[PDB]
Amino acid sequence: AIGEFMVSLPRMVYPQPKVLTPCRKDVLVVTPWLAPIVWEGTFNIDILNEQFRLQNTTIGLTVFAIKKYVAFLKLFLETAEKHFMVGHRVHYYVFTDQPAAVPRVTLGTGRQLSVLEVRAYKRWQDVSMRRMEMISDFCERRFLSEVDYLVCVDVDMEFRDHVGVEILTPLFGTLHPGFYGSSREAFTYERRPQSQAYIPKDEGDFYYGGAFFGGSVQEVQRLTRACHQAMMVDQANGIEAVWHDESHLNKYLLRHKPTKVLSPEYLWDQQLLGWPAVLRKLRFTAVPK
Amino acid sequence: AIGEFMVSLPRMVYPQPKVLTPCRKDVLVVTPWLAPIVWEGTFNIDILNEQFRLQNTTIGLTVFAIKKYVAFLKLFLETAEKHFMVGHRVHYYVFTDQPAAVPRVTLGTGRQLSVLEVRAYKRWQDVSMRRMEMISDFCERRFLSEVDYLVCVDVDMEFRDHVGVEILTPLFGTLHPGFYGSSREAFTYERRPQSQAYIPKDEGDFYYGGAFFGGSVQEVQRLTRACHQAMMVDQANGIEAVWHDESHLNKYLLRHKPTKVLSPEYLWDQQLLGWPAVLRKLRFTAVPKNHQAVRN
Ligand SMILES: O=Cc1ccc(-c2cn([C@@H]3O[C@H](COP(=O)(O)OP(=O)(O)O)[C@@H](O)[C@H]3O)c(=O)[nH]c2=O)s1
Ligand SMILES: O=Cc1ccc(-c2cn([C@@H]3O[C@H](COP(=O)(O)OP(=O)(O)O)[C@@H](O)[C@H]3O)c(=O)[nH]c2=O)s1
Ligand SMILES: CCCCCCCCO[C@@H]1O[C@H](CO)[C@H](O)[C@H](O)[C@H]1O[C@@H]1O[C@@H](C)[C@@H](O)[C@@H](O)[C@@H]1O
Ligand SMILES: CCCCCCCCO[C@@H]1O[C@H](CO)[C@H](O)[C@H](O)[C@H]1O[C@@H]1O[C@@H](C)[C@@H](O)[C@@H](O)[C@@H]1O
Ligand SMILES: [Mn+2]
Ligand SMILES: [Mn+2]
């Protein structure tokens, strides 16, 4: 459950935080709306694990494996078992057009997987964009009565390192790995005013990646419904956003500030971008395709 | 109100946050449990003002002026009018044993003041400590119906710069000006194991000041009730914590991590501690108080 009040921790021994000697001096670790930006060195996972375990937190993880992308499921799930919310309750939701093709993956205690049979759209853009509709529909159908938080990710990925409760919050987005160091005028936001995803050159905080977002079930339901509705308006008006669901995701988080922002540790492509000094860990990374 | 969901902001024009060039590199701006530590340069007040105005946020501000401390009210309130939550709904709660001694202070629109007549304890230590009980009591009687957030401060103080919605969060404490740079072994926590407020030398994140804490009414009710109950246990055990209510506040916040921590910008004594480079603003500062002293 998501507790309405602070929880009481037991005695713990850990290094004292030092007010005058911050660990991370190379990156911004808080947004101008005072949401943490999550990098290695900014959190003590022991304290956070205690806080969330004490609430018996259940985390849902949605992933779409439509048509040939079912091939990505084995590695995705096997590596999630090693790295994703270990110690906590996890409910995987696998959206697929081929239930029989979902690999048999052995799960740790307290972890379960549900297979959701869905339509396969012809255009890859529609497969990607319709995720918003399908998530929003299932936020109502299932997630609201089943999980506390939802984490929505791409399937063509693997976990290489810890992805834990440090990300959980009412609403989070993730810094796109290609653009975290870019100026806002360079962001590939939708720039046509005719699109609902329109963002002018003088607005924008970050470029968030469509491959990793989440939050409380109610905030994710609102986000996904909003994005789908905006995409349908665009479709009626004969327009498709330059980067599809990601463009609408970016318009949504511009107007509704996320309560945490994940660093590109959480969404990386080592093949395309290497391993910069600013990344101490590569947590969730692209698989070649 | 406290909105259940994220609010939708209008178009705004402001400088882009730079991921690779943080403004404050001289201080910790986030705790190990991912709570912001609030310093100048860490927040855009226009964005936060929009977020909170859209929820029609009402902030309560509690202040005790018992016995001679009524002398501090005029300056406290007059400076609060200039610096505290300007633009937002504010409700001042003045707890006092002398209702008639509360000065007339002209208030801006959307701002109001209530005088809460309470008992005056003989010992100054009890006057200070019983604030917890009194705050908790009135949370049930008044605050839950009247405000969204409660801010609880010492009266022997004045505002000198902005104190606004950047501080608002479910539960917050403030870095004590004397110890923000100290190691935990030098923190003046209660060190007696027999005290409910006991914290050993290998525990502790920060030393928070008893003069400035707050949060949602519900969290403040819980904190003040817990601190009062702890003090009553100590009393029954013939124990009084070394720094009274502040010792129990520190025990409580050690075990229930605050969702924001305020920098000593928000609790300072310039006469005693000067003006270190790390403080770009002095927002809420000590006023001389030796003349209002009353011998037990
Ligand atoms: O051959 C072109 C394709 C582009 C996307 C395709 C696709 C994507 N997806 C899902 O949408 C997500 C986004 O597509 P993508 O990973 O290929 O997009 P990018 O991360 O490369 O921008 C995938 O991770 C899957 O979850 C599918 O399940 N089946 C698919 O056939 S197929
Ligand atoms: O002569 C010794 C005294 C110590 C505290 C006294 C006192 C405090 N108070 C309140 O307790 C708060 C804390 O006491 P303090 O400011 O004097 O002490 P510090 O906590 O700053 O060390 C004050 O700000 C007032 O709100 C009173 O209302 N009346 C008082 O007579 S009197
Ligand atoms: C230095 C100048 C900017 C250089 C930027 C280089 C990475 C570009 O990235 C693409 O960015 C698009 C938005 O503009 C979409 O997010 C697309 O899905 C993404 O590629 C996806 O994510 C990438 C990380 C790769 O994994 C690619 O294979 C994916 O298709
Ligand atoms: C390692 C060197 C540490 C050096 C610390 C120097 C400041 C000490 O401060 C006192 O600290 C106490 C706890 O230990 C209480 O909070 C007390 O109320 C406070 O004095 C109050 O606040 C002060 C700022 C002054 O305004 C003083 O007049 C007040 O009575
Ligand atoms: Mn992908
Ligand atoms: Mn004081």
Side-chain angles (χ1 to χ4, degrees), chain B residues 261-287:
Chain B
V261 176
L262 309 183
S263 68
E265 294 171 1
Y266 292 80
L267 182 58
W268 197 253
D269 183 336
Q270 189 186 350
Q271 206 293 323
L272 188 66
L273 299 160
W275 194 332
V278 288
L279 302 177
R280 293 184 185 179
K281 293 189 184 308
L282 300 186
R283 310 170 188 275
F284 185 59
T285 64
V287 173

Side-chain angles (χ1 to χ4, degrees), chain B residues 12-251:
Chain B
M12 301 173 71
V13 173
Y14 52 81
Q16 178 198 353
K18 301 307 290 151
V19 176
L20 295 186
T21 51
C23 177
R24 301 303 298 259
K25 314 189 298 298
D26 54 334
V27 293
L28 191 64
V29 307
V30 68
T31 73
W33 55 94
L34 295 174
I37 307 174
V38 182
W39 299 91
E40 182 67 8
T42 61
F43 61 89
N44 179 316
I45 197 51
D46 299 318
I47 302 181
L48 292 168
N49 272 337
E50 281 281 347
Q51 289 182 315
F52 285 92
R53 256 324 274 161
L54 287 164
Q55 302 171 73
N56 185 62
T57 302
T58 299
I59 304 90
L61 179 56
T62 65
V63 79
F64 292 72
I66 301 305
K67 301 177 201 172
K68 299 180 188 176
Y69 278 58
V70 293
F72 294 111
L73 283 167
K74 184 177 169 72
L75 183 70
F76 181 90
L77 291 173
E78 280 176 357
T79 63
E81 281 298 298
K82 309 300 266 286
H83 295 294
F84 184 75
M85 306 289 173
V86 176
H88 298 276
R89 291 275 319 282
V90 173
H91 197 143
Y92 299 104
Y93 293 100
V94 174
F95 289 83
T96 183
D97 60 325
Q98 308 153 76
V102 181
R104 63 179 172 280
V105 181
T106 302
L107 307 183
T109 189
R111 301 172 77 100
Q112 65 181 297
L113 186 150
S114 294
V115 178
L116 311 176
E117 186 174 7
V118 295
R119 166 184 175 178
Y121 283 83
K122 296 178 185 292
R123 295 175 69 246
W124 69 261
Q125 292 93 332
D126 293 318
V127 168
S128 184
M129 284 186 288
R130 293 287 180 154
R131 291 188 295 168
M132 295 300 197
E133 182 184 16
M134 292 176 180
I135 293 165
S136 178
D137 184 39
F138 278 90
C139 279
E140 199 55 66
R141 298 167 59 166
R142 299 276 312 263
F143 301 155
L144 280 162
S145 304
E146 291 173 25
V147 304
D148 303 302
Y149 293 93
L150 277 172
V151 176
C152 309
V153 300
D154 273 24
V155 73
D156 55 325
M157 304 286 291
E158 67 180 313
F159 293 85
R160 289 168 55 175
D161 212 329
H162 174 94
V163 177
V165 299
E166 76 279 357
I167 72 174
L168 302 176
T169 191
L171 176 61
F172 72 85
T174 298
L175 303 179
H176 190 296
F179 302 91
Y180 67 90
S182 298
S183 293
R184 51 157 64 122
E185 18 284 309
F187 292 165
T188 59
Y189 292 149
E190 174 54 61
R191 300 305 188 174
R192 291 173 288 174
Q194 295 74 25
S195 174
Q196 296 308 302
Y198 172 64
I199 307 177
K201 287 198 150 60
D202 65 345
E203 290 181 57
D205 305 309
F206 304 113
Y207 190 83
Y208 303 101
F212 201 151
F213 65 89
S216 66
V217 176
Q218 296 240 6
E219 293 283 4
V220 171
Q221 177 170 38
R222 284 174 149 260
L223 178 157
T224 55
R225 181 174 56 235
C227 289
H228 168 65
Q229 287 175 2
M231 289 181 284
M232 293 301 94
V233 168
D234 265 15
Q235 178 181 56
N237 289 332
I239 294 172
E240 190 172 276
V242 56
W243 289 109
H244 320 104
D245 38 293
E246 178 176 88
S247 295
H248 298 271
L249 173 63
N250 273 280
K251 185 55 166 280

Side-chain angles (χ1 to χ4, degrees), chain A residues 9-30:
Chain A
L9 299 167
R11 160 176 159 88
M12 302 174 65
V13 171
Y14 51 83
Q16 184 204 164
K18 304 312 289 284
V19 174
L20 300 183
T21 47
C23 183
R24 293 312 294 265
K25 297 193 287 76
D26 55 331
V27 296
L28 187 64
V29 302
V30 66

